[model samples]
Target: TSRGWNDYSCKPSAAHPRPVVLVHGTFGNSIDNWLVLAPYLVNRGYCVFSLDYGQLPGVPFFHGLGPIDKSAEQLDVFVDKVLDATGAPKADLVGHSQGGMMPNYYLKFLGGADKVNALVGIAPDNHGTTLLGLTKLLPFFPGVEKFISDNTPGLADQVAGSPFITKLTAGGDTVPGVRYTVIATKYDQVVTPYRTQYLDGPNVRNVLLQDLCPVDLSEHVAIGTIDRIAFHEVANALDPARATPTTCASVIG
Candidate 1:
């Protein structure tokens, strides 16, 4: 799978001008998070690359556990390196879980809109506010915040209705010049009330996995990791012009 991508020498062809960058979620590293999706893209002629962001000091495999804001900064340099190597002006970002929602912070506040062509979120909790009102109080209270954030700052920042989520979506869910596609599974338990994953903006397109294929009951992890049905939709989002119709039979692909 590493040979399929992560090849800095790989340059994107004309059909797929921009490379696709895979952003893994909380507790996810680049390799394990994209085991299925990365090779899928490479087989389709995309210069795909995955990143390991938000690593704690001594954590080995487990990552994306640091503060998300700092993680977004990590994303900033990674995308730059991808662009630098491929000689492409921009790249497409496809993230799952926290990987899905955190990109908005980079795009809107960190000037990622200029470096990204499209953002395809696989069950991103864009408006995590819908998760719980109790989380919003984390920022208001110092003691509670210190206790949790002291260990896993990323976890505390992503508690649905925290200061991090609030400020990320303050102006809008998306920035201009970047196309947004959100793919959500109805059975998601991680980002509950799945509808909250949808982004509201001018160039946003929200997709329900079940809508494409009636009986495909993929959940949060399935959609991002190994759901072929969801992968078909992701292919469509990446290359809409030549996209094919996705159905229950897409599992074979």
Candidate 2:
């Protein structure tokens, strides 16, 4: 069966009861972002599904270019479709970059908490990002920021301190009844000061990749794209009851 693209024939097993939905980041599509992790989860007995959201009309092979809230709405409907197909009570989410953080909008405002059991973000911008000061340069460019925002809402929303970011992180970083897990790398260049990716609330687990294995050198995209150590942590976050301590050796699993 296709890995990231839709495959309705896949069903959740009794062992892995909930379907796992993979969310991609800005300029990332369902197929490109999760090629390795999707197969990894499927091989581990999980029913994995991924979607393409936030797409502009002319863009092909890349997505996550629209408004974050609207993208979350796309996720809401996709989760419903996955649940309906798998006959599962709820689903788990594993996202990368914006993929990791945008789901919060769905969980908090779109009523996704009731339908989602867990959210594991790999280098997500939960509190928005500075992008190494590129966002600050937006003002110097005059209409550049507005032009980008008008064309690509995802980029505009991700800038640290933007109105969207402010509203998303306002009251709290989480909602009730959903488990949150953040996997961050100190080397992340996209979401600078990656500590912001960690959420502050109940039912949250924040992890730094280097803490698990000092030798692991995965950055933002590498962690989500092909890093197995992070994948192991995601597995643990999904099934904490049966989880084993992850180490450098866990990458082979």
Candidate 3:
């Protein structure tokens, strides 16, 4: 059965020992965005879950296209449900793109830090992004922002430096008690200027996909989808106590 707008539930296992919640980016649903990563985490013994948020009504299987702040609020509820079911004090979060960035708002403003143990972002847009210079070209066109907001509120909300990102990173980014990790790739076309994907704060570990495995040519989608090297890095991020140094040759299926 469908878990409604936000779904997926599982109990924590001993080997993994923590609950992990996956958030998907714009134009992505719960299942598609996390197809590779969720299974990987689950296989590693973590209780894994995923959610579909920001759905525009009447759309069959598209989501994360509404207001991002609202998406954060939805995540807050989803986290509570996961915690209640699993009886875990805190859960680890893994997200892609907007999925990667929105959780920060929940942590900073919505009391998410207390309930979350670690946050792993794959090709996240932490600071802000323009989709590889695309957003810069958008502002010059007259009435474009208004037209987009009117037709697609979700699209307007995703533009770099929009109110969503503005409110998310307005203050100190890192909240105490939560560890952070970000996985980025040089080939990412979505979160341009890949450095924007990195976060600076105590306990935050940011990794470049290529740096960890030089041969990996994953972009935004692969970072969250098919890249095994990225998943290997995710495993390391989830269980840092058992982490090993990764190299270019570590890219494998």
RMSD of each: 5.4, 4.3, 5.0
lDDT, candidate 1, at 50: 90
- lDDT values of the candidates? 0.83, 0.84, 0.76
Q: Which of 1 and 3 is the better model by TM-score?
A: 1
In candidate 2, what are the lDDT values of residues 83-181, reduced to their tens digit? 898788999999998999999999888889999999999999898875543354334234434334443577878887888898888888989999999
Best by lDDT: 2
TM-score of each: 0.90, 0.90, 0.86
**Which regions of candidate 2 are displaced past 4 Å?**
1-5, 131-151
Point out where model 3 deviates above 4 Å: 1-9, 131-151
Candidate order by lDDT, highest to lowest?
2, 1, 3
| Count of backbone collisions within predicted model 1 | 0
Off by over 4 Å in 1: 1-3, 129-151
* Tens-digit lDDT string for candidate 1 (2-116): 2247888888889898989999986678998788889889989899989999898766666777889999999999999999988999999999888988889999888999999
- Which residue pairs show collisions in model 2? none
Q: Model 1 Cα displacement at 87 (Å)?
A: 0.5
The stretch of ten residues in a row with the least summed lDDT in candidate 1 is: 133-142
